[PDB]
């Protein structure tokens, strides 16, 4: 069954997290804008395989708004990183399968680099390297300004805009919310603090994907660095969303790619 | 000043082509369409930077149409490499930096694993290693039919659609009859013939680029095998039709990347 609800860990972040299933963990962390009911539909698939999973709301985002300032400011990938950890250690996850998109993937980056014991395969998806143009004025205009740009943004990349829509109002509502508060915080620090160096990437096995109908040369550094690297890459169908554009394609990939490391 | 012309060489094909400059030479190679009236501006920036340009009609395509079946049925880069070596010969072209999309990129990649003599540099842009979705079935289709389909696809792909709009009439005219040629001999063949083994790869200088604005997929597999080789890769605005959409950008990547292994 799926449970739902809130934990407050030690640096003052009241989580509102879900959990389903039970065997080897997996973690899905959201995307930049923070919310985990994106993950509703693929959850169910991915538990019903076998896997505890858990998703919860990023750090004063959406039903985790309820947290300290310094929890949404000036965010990079490590620092996603070490309150992710701190939850973990508060719901016992020792050692994780663990998925992330944008910033998510920042901090399966980071996770991967400077947490490796508690990584059993990383999942990124569209690590950002560079800030891209349409997003670099973003904080420059008014709040309300900011939220319809970036809700037009984000459907636009959806990679299904039926499938976006069917979020749901209550979903949209909270981004709402969200989209100033990611503009402030995110999208200036993310990319330059991308680890994405050598040293960062050999801990662990990494599985990186970037979607299949997203532009090339948004996420062509991905590509680039991962094949140079050795570390397996392709794509998910989809664009930034996989997992709400096609969630049987992306739990499927989640499960075969986890399951590989078993033992 | 711009010279034009046709030429019969040994196999049979009455060639069209165009020429413009002094200096070393510079061959584009168009793409699957053969339709060299796409390079028209960027010819004369190019040619303005001391290189002698050409570009012509492809086998069986557009202005040089009166040519044998053969040299468009079953078309791979290696046949059309011949093709082209034979012409060059006739208009007594020695060494050149060859730029080519799509088939015509396929075309580079076999002289320059074969014909490295020839190549001083080879630009392949968006090598077709596999059948994308769309073209799976459209040789099975019928001539209006195709040149409907295909017509609109291009445009789509183009990267700019006024600009490919105002590419004219007789350009259009031409690009209409020519479609159903293309896809009755290339599709099938090209994609599996792809020269981008680890053999093709490495006599020349390779300087291989994709499309910004093309969705991942269509040519990840590009991005990947260059990288994994160490093959210098990278962007150009626009879609598959760089040297429509944007003749400045193009002219002047050609240009730049031409003139570092000059002298």
Known sequence: TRTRGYVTTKDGIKWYYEQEGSGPDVVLIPDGLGECQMFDKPMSLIASNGFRVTTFDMPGMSRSSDAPPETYQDITGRKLAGYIITLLDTLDIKIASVWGCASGASTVLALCSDYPERVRNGMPHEVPTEN????????????????????????????????????????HARLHDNYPRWAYGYPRTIPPSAPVKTEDLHKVP?????????????????????????????TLPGNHFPYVSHPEEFAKYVVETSRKYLK
Chains 1, 2 share one sequence.
């Open 132 to 171: 891209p143009d349409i997003l670099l004025h973003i904080h420059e205009v008014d709040p309300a300004t900011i939220s319809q740009e970036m809700a037009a943004n984000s459907r636009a990349y959806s990679g299904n805009v039926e499938a976006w829509d069917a979020l749901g109002p209550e979903v």
């Open 206 to 234: 990494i599985d990186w994907t970037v979607g299949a109908s997203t532009p090339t040369k948004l996420f062509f550094e991905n590509i680039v660095i991962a094949a140079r690297e050795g570390i397996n890459i392709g």
